[PDB]
């Protein structure tokens, strides 16, 4: 019960009224990538994220019974390795899914 209190206190401490877009740039670039059916512009964003951003990003994938985001994201990586560029990173984006 005492351990719940620290989280409540941090939330109370920060009450910024600033509004940040409801849909993040990532999920929005995933969404346009899937609709377009070409992620070549998507994967150019995944190179330029920080490693700090990528763990925050791939954990933040909408997973549900229909599984739309995960299947969109795998089809980015398969379309990556067909281009053969950046063979190191796209397999680590693959392995980071399975963790």
């Amino acid at each position: 019960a005492q351990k719940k209190l620290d989280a409540e206190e941090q939330m109370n401490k920060f009450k910024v009224t600033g509004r940040l877009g409801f849909e993040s740039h990532f999920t929005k670039q995933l969404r346009e990538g899937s609709q377009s059916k070409d992620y070549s512009s998507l994967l150019a964003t995944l190179i330029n994220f920080s490693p700090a951003a990528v763990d925050l990003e791939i954990r933040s994938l909408n997973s549900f019974e229909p599984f739309d985001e995960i299947v969109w994201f795998i089809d980015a990586l398969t379309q990556g390795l067909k281009s053969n560029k950046n063979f190191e990173l796209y397999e680590t984006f693959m392995s980071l899914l399975f963790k």
Partner: protein, 740 residues
């Protein structure tokens, strides 16, 4: 099955019937239903559902359960013990009185017939007739979904088209296949479960040859009185209550012996007529009269003294509702008094309120009432209305009402699949879906269609789900007498007098209407008349609105959502910010959002005397997708019309309507804030939520994880300020348990 009980019962039936009780068999063979007995036995053998159509006093209800039962007793197959007969009745008094009469027709032989109703019931063994209410069988279907523990199901009085009898018939389409030898969609054998539909002569073809016929019944039997003369108000002399009393007195002196059956509207006028004939040249006839009240909530229907003909020298008068029209049959009647009035329940689909109103009787009902005087001798029917009122007022709905109340109710009788429920004329499946979407928006159902805990409270409440929710919110938010009156009514300088009673800064129309009632209850004596003149009010409607308030409290306490003070159920600066949240809880998802710079106090230019602010607003809603982003404006009857300088930018409405100049108008409105809304849209599918997003989020585990949540609404859905929320990720989902 058990063989030694069978041959014991087979022997005992023949011993009693042949040589101990052939005097009420003579009475049974005088009923028209006996003439077709053998044919009914062969018809149920060859056909697994059959329909018996029969007019008032045919004997269908009393005799047909006995015949099939006696047939199984006299036979090696069907044996006695596989014989379990269940008989559906629409009204409690009919189920008790038919069971008691059938018991007298079978003597002291043993438990052969009983009844089973809500709170007054016995079980039964194998070998047994059971008269029960429709809503008993619908509750039993929660454990016996396909009716395993009964061998024949008799649906009586199906012509009245009660919601339960229509539901059971649609369920029978689903049920008859898997008990009755349909093995994987193919018909392989003779259907084990037998069914009998029984009906009066009112739209027999809805149940014997219509579009939705196929699960009802393929063979039809029509089972057939002395002349009953028809008199109308032209040949009678009786204008009102104490005049109906004058009539009972008139046919005492003339019109030689026989019982008087007085059809009245309902319990309130039953009470006044019973008093006029017991505490009255009036007292000349008190002691010569036996006056009996008859109603579904009174014990008389279950007592042998009503069906008993009176002591010598005394005239029997029966003061009854529509219960004596088809459900309860008293054989000594010769004089029928028809008031032409009765009560019915109307659901208004756009208003969400169920009303219980005083209607006029149907042409069919009036003729059915005439047939209650022709059983013992030639009789007379005294109709207390003009022959013109027979033509115009008297009728000779499921396709023209919003259906949300019914869809929610069917799930308490265990009828989950609404689309699979047949009726004599089916509704559109678009209507059925729209009502489910409304129920899902309120959170009465989940987004897989299953009943919620709130939806169960809402189905036990005797009013539409939107306003049953509004009452339940007034429990929590401590404003009960105010809200119960509002909900009751919809179920059933003059400018500064208006702005004084609005009470600023409270701009709520609904709170305003209570503040008018609080002011009405503050104008005692002669001040009442000059108050209603000063403030442009309707005294009589204010009295009705107050009468409905009490009702809302009586119903909510009886559904166990309010406390009671010594058994009694009572409806009785205000938290104007709390009230708007509760109003929002009933009007959700109908939300509108006002937009700068054209809507606000920028438009304060110039029109002298009657200043007009010019309002740029669209609707924001997800449960009415077709009004999403639609341009709207206030109606001129609404007080928000032409106003500026409002404290929030968000409002909710009941009704939105397009009229002259194509300006889509909101008829009635209330100013609401975003934090009140948030919780209102958290019920289910309508609220749109997003992933967590600076501020860190602490996750205790897989489920437990708190973070800022960006909830969306809704088609068009607007965004909203993030709400620190506790989301217990259940079933791999971040659903918000509570707003922190």
């Amino acid at each position: 099955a058990y063989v030694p009980i069978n041959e014991n019962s087979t022997r005992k039936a023949f011993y009693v019937e042949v040589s101990r009780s052939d005097e009420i068999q003579k009475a049974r063979i005088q009923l028209p239903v006996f003439g077709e007995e053998h044919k009914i036995m062969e018809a149920i053998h060859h056909n697994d559902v059959v329909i018996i159509c029969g007019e008032t006093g045919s004997g269908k209800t009393t005799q047909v359960p006995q015949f099939l039962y006696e047939a199984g007793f006299g036979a090696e197959d069907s044996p006695d013990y596989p014989g379990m007969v269940g008989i559906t009745q629409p009204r409690r008094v009919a189920a008790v009185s038919m069971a008691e009469r059938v018991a007298n027709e079978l003597g002291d032989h043993g438990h052969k017939v009983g009844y089973q109703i809500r709170f007054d019931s016995t079980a039964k063994e194998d070998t047994k007739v059971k008269f029960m209410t429709d809503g008993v069988l619908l509750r039993e279907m929660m454990h016996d979904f396909k009716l395993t523990k009964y061998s024949s199901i008799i649906i009586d009085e199906a012509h009245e088209r009660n919601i339960n009898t229509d539901i059971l018939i649609g369920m029978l389409s689903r049920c008859v296949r898997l008990r009755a030898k349909l093995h994987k969609e193919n018909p392989i054998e003779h259907k084990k479960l037998k069914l009998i539909i029984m009906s009066a002569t009112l739209r027999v073809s809805d149940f014997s040859e219509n579009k939705t016929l196929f699960p009802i019944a393929p063979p039809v039997l029509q089972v057939d009185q002395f002349p009953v003369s028809i008199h109308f108000n032209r040949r009678t002399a009786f204008n009102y209550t104490d005049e109906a009393f004058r009539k009972t007195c008139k046919i005492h002196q003339k019109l030689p012996p026989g019982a008087i059956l007085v059809f009245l509207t309902g319990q309130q006028e039953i009470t006044h007529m019973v008093k006029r004939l017991r505490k009255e040249e009036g007292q000349t006839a008190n002691d010569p009269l036996y006056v009996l009240p008859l109603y579904s909530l009174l014990p008389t229907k279950e007592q042998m003294r009503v069906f008993q003909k009176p002591p010598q020298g005394s005239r029997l008068c029966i003061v009854a509702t529509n219960v004596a029209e088809t459900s309860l049959t008293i054989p000594g009647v010769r004089y029928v008094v028809d008031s032409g009035r009765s009560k019915e329940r109307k659901y208004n689909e756009s208003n969400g309120v169920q009303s219980f109103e005083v209607g006029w009787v149907s042409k069919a009902s009036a003729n059915q009432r005439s047939g209650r005087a022709g059983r013992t001798g030639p009789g007379h029917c005294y109709r207390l209305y003009s022959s013109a009122v027979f033509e115009h007022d008297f009728e000779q709905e499921i396709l023209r009402m919003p259906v949300e109340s019914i869809v929610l109710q069917m799930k308490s009788m265990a009828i989950h699949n609404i689309i699979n429920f047949p009726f004599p004329t089916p509704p559109d499946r678009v209507a059925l879906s729209k009502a489910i979407q409304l129920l899902q928006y309120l959170g009465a159902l989940d987004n897989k269609e299953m009943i919620t805990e709130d939806g169960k409270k809402m189905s036990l409440f005797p009013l539409s789900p939107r306003f049953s929710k509004m009452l339940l919110v007034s429990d929590e938010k401590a404003c009960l007498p105010y809200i119960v009156a509002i909900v009751s009514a919809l179920s059933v300088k003059f400018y500064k007098s208006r702005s004084q009673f609005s009470k600023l800064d409270k701009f709520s129309d609904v709170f305003r209407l209570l503040s008018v009632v609080s002011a009405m209850d503050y104008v005692p004596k002669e001040q009442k008349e000059i108050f209603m003149k000063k403030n442009f009010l309707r005294g009589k409607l204010m009295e009705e609105i107050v009468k409905l308030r009490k009702q809302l409290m009586y119903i909510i306490k009886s559904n166990t959502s309010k406390e009671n003070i010594a058994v009694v159920i009572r409806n009785e600066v205000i938290q104007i910010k709390l009230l708007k949240q509760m109003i929002c809880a009933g009007f959700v998802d109908h939300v509108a959002v006002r937009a700068d710079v054209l809507f606000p106090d920028d438009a304060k230019i110039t029109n002298r005397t009657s200043i007009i602010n010019i309002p740029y607003i669209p609707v924001l809603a997800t449960r009415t997708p077709n009004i999403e982003d639609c341009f709207v404006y206030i109606h001129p009857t609404s007080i928000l019309n032409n106003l500026g300088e409002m404290p929030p930018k968000y409002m909710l409405y009941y009704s939105l309507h397009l009229g002259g100049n194509n300006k889509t108008r909101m008829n009635t409105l209330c100013d609401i804030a975003s934090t009140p809304l948030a919780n209102i849209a958290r019920k289910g599918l309508l609220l749109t939520y997003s992933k967590p997003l600076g501020l860190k989020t602490v996750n205790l585990s897989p489920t437990e994880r708190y973070c800022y949540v960006v909830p969306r609404f809704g088609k068009i859905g607007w965004d909203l300020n993030p709400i620190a929320v506790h989301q217990k990720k259940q079933k791999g989902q971040w659903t918000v348990i509570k707003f922190i």
